[PDB]
Amino acid sequence: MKLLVVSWGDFERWKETKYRFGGETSVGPSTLPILQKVIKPDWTVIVLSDTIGKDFSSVETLREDVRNRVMDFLDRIGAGREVDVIIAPGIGEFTHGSFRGSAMDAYYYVLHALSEIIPTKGDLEVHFDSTHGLNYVTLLTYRALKDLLGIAAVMNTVTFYAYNSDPFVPKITKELNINTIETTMVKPTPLSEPLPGFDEYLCPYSMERAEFVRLKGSLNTLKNLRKEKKKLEAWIGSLLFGLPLLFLEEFPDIGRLESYIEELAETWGGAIAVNAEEKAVTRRLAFGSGFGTLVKLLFQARITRGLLVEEPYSIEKLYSVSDRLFRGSTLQRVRVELGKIEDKAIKYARKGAFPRDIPLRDFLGFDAANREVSPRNVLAHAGLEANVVEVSMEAWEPKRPEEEAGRHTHLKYTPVGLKKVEDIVSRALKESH
Amino acid sequence: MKLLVVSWGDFERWKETKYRFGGETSVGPSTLPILQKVIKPDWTVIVLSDTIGKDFSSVETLREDVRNRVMDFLDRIGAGREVDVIIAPGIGEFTHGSFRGSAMDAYYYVLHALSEIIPTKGDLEVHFDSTHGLNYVTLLTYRALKDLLGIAAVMNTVTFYAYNSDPFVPKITKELNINTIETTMVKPTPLSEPLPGFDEYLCPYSMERAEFVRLKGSLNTLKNLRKEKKKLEAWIGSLLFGLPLLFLEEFPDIGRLESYIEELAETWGGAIAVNAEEKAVTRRLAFGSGFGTLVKLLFQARITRGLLVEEPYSIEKLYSVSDRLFRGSTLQRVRVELGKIEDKAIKYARKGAFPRDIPLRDFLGFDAANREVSPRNVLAHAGLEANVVEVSMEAWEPKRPEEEAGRHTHLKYTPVGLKKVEDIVSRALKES
Numbered sequence: 001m002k003l004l005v006v007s008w009g010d011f012e013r014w015k016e017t018k019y020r021f022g023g024e025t026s027v028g029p030s031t032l033p034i035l036q037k038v039i040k041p042d043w044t045v046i047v048l049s050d051t052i053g054k055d056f057s058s059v060e061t062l063r064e065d066v067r068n069r070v071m072d073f074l075d076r077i078g079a080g081r082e083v084d085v086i087i088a089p090g091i092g093e094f095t096h097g098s099f100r101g102s103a104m105d106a107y108y109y110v111l112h113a114l115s116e117i118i119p120t121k122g123d124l125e126v127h128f129d130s131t132h133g134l135n136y137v138t139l140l141t142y143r144a145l146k147d148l149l150g151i152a153a154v155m156n157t158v159t160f161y162a163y164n165s166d167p168f169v170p171k172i173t174k175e176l177n178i179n180t181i182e183t184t185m186v187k188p189t190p191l192s193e194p195l196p197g198f199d200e201y202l203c204p205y206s207m208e209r210a211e212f213v214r215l216k217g218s219l220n221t222l223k224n225l226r227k228e229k230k231k232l233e234a235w236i237g238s239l240l241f242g243l244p245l246l247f248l249e250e251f252p253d254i255g256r257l258e259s260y261i262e263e264l265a266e267t268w269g270g271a272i273a274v275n276a277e278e279k280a281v282t283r284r285l286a287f288g289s290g291f292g293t294l295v296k297l298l299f300q301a302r303i304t305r306g307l308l309v310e311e312p313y314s315i316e317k318l319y320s321v322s323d324r325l326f327r328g329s330t331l332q333r334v335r336v337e338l339g340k341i342e343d344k345a346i347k348y349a350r351k352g353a354f355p356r357d358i359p360l361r362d363f364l365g366f367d368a369a370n371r372e373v374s375p376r377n378v379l380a381h382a383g384l385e386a387n388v389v390e391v392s393m394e395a396w397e398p399k400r401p402e403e404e405a406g407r408h409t410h411l412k413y414t415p416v417g418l419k420k421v422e423d424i425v426s427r428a429l430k431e432s433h
Numbered sequence: 434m435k436l437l438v439v440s441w442g443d444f445e446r447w448k449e450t451k452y453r454f455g456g457e458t459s460v461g462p463s464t465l466p467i468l469q470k471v472i473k474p475d476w477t478v479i480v481l482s483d484t485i486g487k488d489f490s491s492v493e494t495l496r497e498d499v500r501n502r503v504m505d506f507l508d509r510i511g512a513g514r515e516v517d518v519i520i521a522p523g524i525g526e527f528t529h530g531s532f533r534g535s536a537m538d539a540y541y542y543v544l545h546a547l548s549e550i551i552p553t554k555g556d557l558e559v560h561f562d563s564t565h566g567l568n569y570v571t572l573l574t575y576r577a578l579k580d581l582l583g584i585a586a587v588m589n590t591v592t593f594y595a596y597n598s599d600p601f602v603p604k605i606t607k608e609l610n611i612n613t614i615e616t617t618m619v620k621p622t623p624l625s626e627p628l629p630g631f632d633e634y635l636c637p638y639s640m641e642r643a644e645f646v647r648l649k650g651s652l653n654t655l656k657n658l659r660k661e662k663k664k665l666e667a668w669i670g671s672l673l674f675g676l677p678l679l680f681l682e683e684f685p686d687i688g689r690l691e692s693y694i695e696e697l698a699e700t701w702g703g704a705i706a707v708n709a710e711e712k713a714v715t716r717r718l719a720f721g722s723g724f725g726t727l728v729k730l731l732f733q734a735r736i737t738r739g740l741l742v743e744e745p746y747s748i749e750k751l752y753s754v755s756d757r758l759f760r761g762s763t764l765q766r767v768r769v770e771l772g773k774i775e776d777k778a779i780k781y782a783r784k785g786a787f788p789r790d791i792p793l794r795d796f797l798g799f800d801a802a803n804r805e806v807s808p809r810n811v812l813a814h815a816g817l818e819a820n821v822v823e824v825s826m827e828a829w830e831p832k833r834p835e836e837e838a839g840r841h842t843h844l845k846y847t848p849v850g851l852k853k854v855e856d857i858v859s860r861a862l863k864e865s
Contacts, residue, residue: 092602094602095605103597104612104613130572134600138572167527169525181537242762328674376769
């Protein structure tokens, strides 16, 4: 997959000029046609501001106005119609109208938009053109792209290239070169924010206190997220800290995440007041960090959903899951722990023994000291602490148990144990923020 | 400590307007006064393209010209004395001059500039304004800030704000609000990239390939990096993987890193050809990723120099170092491993036994047949692998061995062990 993303301003006010890029040459007002010719992307994404729109009879007429104007210009230049247009909420008082709201709305809207576009299977080569963009929309688009690509890198290889053209001088300019200003192999960065308190999903920009309290109090999301919060924070922690069994047992409900994001995103869109006479758009609700955390959580869930399997979890499965999610010293300590449990099963098997629903402590043969569940041991033993895990050996007739024991030995958290791990990991996630 | 960074283009062509910010109001051509009033910055930095320079006698007359007119403007709106100004290398054909070079030189030059300004001690509250910036110089400045603060976050609390104003639109604007476009607590991101091949410290932009090979061969930096490259990647690995004994033994020479950066910086500057008649600057050398990696490596070293304890390295010191340097599961893993060794030393101390210069495998009492040094065991056991570490206990008269053993028990890599570990960590960093 090759993805070209382009940050745009007022594309009608652009002058014709020449562009050099990849030994090719292009006469036109925009960088997009030569960028497509050289890079040959599988998909193009154009990111521009609401403040280009010249219609205030509706919020959906305002967008179709902008989308049409963009579709004309793509015919004007040689640009293909294979594109997505993210019409992001911009700010400021213009001659053709007025737009007010949180300036950070643009980030959260593009973040959510890009989460539904960037593929969640396969490698990503990403090209971002910033030549034509507004400073603040281009930073917030750059920030939103990077933050999602980082979650993508956990499971897949992600290369990111960024271009800007030579600055434009009215009639001195003969040919602007399109420079590469970044080429990066994107580091894997799993989500490491806890979900915030219920003040930080939607905030009131221009709305009477009681109306806001009614909208907030109407949201199913905030009600459910109260009871679910800890289990989701336990899942986030299982990627960050190297807990392969917690990852499987705590794997989120994608449908319920999809539900929360759509409810919050719909409430936002609905509270946009477009006053048609006086040419004015007020976004009376602002997005909060909690919306971005949900968008990112659902994107990390989609990226990793391919690893999930049914409820009997074998040491061999935990090995395979671990080799995708983890790297460096985290990957290696996980393998040593699975090693210790695996080697003990091989011993049990040579003796013709197959214990079932036995605590890991009894399975490894520990002393009667320390029945407490400390953060230390839960995090140091890749979440496979001896007082919280239950082991089951599915009976078989060994002949080479060294390669057979992994498929037949299953780990499970106890119902009591899982609650102790969720606290420790949830607290450890919040204490690292 | 509160810091204010701003991105500037041509600050003369800016009209008077009024700006609202944080229960305040101000009238001027720029946001800096009201930003400086509301935010009470302990220090301020301004990043401008050099492409606003007019007098092309040579390089020091451009930077001079640009610094003069800036220092005029900062008196016109009373921007105080607590200020640094970074004249970054821009490119393009302008009305009063032409500038040629890699577009990425402004990233590395500003990264270098910022690396000597940002405090490497105590917490940081960084405020960034992009209102008056060129797109690319503002994006590279933002990227350069984040890269360094991420390293500072290893050791200190770092909070970051970005601002941009409502657009100035000349023929309807009454007043412009200063919007906060970002509020973030900066995640600790240790340096996580190997040093590259000796092609990628300085690259020729417009130098004939025979002249480049000449000057690459005269740099004392690339010859001294030949030796150390592995020893430095080992150190980078020590933070990233949780190897606190390797962090101490491989702790780089800051004076020697300083001199490498300055030799690459002053070699780049000395390949800038200025033509007074053609009004044309040409940067014939471009900075490579490797220049960026050295600047970041020197920055991580200054940030953590405080953790380099005196010899010998005791289990108590390794605990102390570890507690500062590592978080989450990596910290808990390292603590359990030092605890294995400590608990052993306690048992020895109780029997009045004080083994001196004994391999860790004999101290822990291991089987034979396992003297191969694997990636797995070096990375999984916090670099304290039983075939590469030597233990000593300084004998004493114990009263509470559970408190004393920590202070009197010293670890170090064997000379053979350290070279194997360097190879394993260096390699693990390259596969990343």
